Each structure stands twice: as C-alpha cells, then as structure tokens.
Amino acid sequence: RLILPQLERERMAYGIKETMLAKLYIELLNLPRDGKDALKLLNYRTPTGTHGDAGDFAMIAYFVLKPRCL
DNA sequence: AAAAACTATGCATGCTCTACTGCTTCTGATCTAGTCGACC
C-alpha cells in the first residue's frame, strides 16, 4: 500500500494536500508565519526563491526539514 | 460642702454589603474565502 498509495481503498481520504500539509508542518514546527521557510513551503510552486527544486513540494519540505530532524 | 468614679453620648475610622458604571477580555454566532474528493 505504501509503495502505491494511489491504489489504497481500505483507508479513507486523508483530506490533507500540499497546502494543508504545508500549513500543518508550519504549525507543528513552530516556524515563523511570515518567515522564509513558511513562504517557501506555502509557495512551493514559485521559483523566485531559486532553492533547488521549484515544483516538487517533497524536495522543498526535505530541504526545510534537513536541519530540524534526526 | 468638696473630690472622685460611673454612665451617657458622639463623632470619627475602617470594614462590609450593595449597588452602579466603565473598561478589558473571553466565548459564541455568523459571513466569506480557500481547500479537498469524486467524477467527467
């Protein structure tokens, strides 16, 4: 199921997507609301930040979380 | 006849209830914008 989440049927809809997941990450990590990391996570599509990948939300989240996790 | 002791009282303090009015803050209801899931 983890390898192919799209085929999951037993589990109900998560209800969280890129925007909601970014908001939850900002709230939990206690990052500043108007800080660079929060804007990058929320505006992951915008390439103005020129921080590695500009379209992949997962890559931006990994870059933001590299110094925050074990 | 003269001095001392007890009682009336009375005005002022601080406390207490009781209420009234104002400001600050918390809760709840409502409106509006954004988001997710399903399909096609």
Residue A45 CA, nucleotide B24 C1', distance (Å): 44
Sign of the C-alpha dihedral, residues A11, A13, A17, A20?
negative
Distance CA A26, CA A15 (A): 17
> Who touches strand B, with Cβ under 7 Å?
A 13-21
Nucleotide with minimal C1' distance from the CA of A15 is: B36
Distance of CA A3 to the CA centre of its chain: 19
Method of determination is: cryo-EM
Closest to A58 in 3D by CA, of A43, A37, A44, A39: A44
Cα gap A20→A56, rounded to integer Å? 15
3-state secondary structure A21-35: HHHHHHHHHCCCCCC
Contact indicator for A36, A26 with CB cutoff of 8 Å: no
Helices (H), A1-70: 18-29, 36-42, 57-65
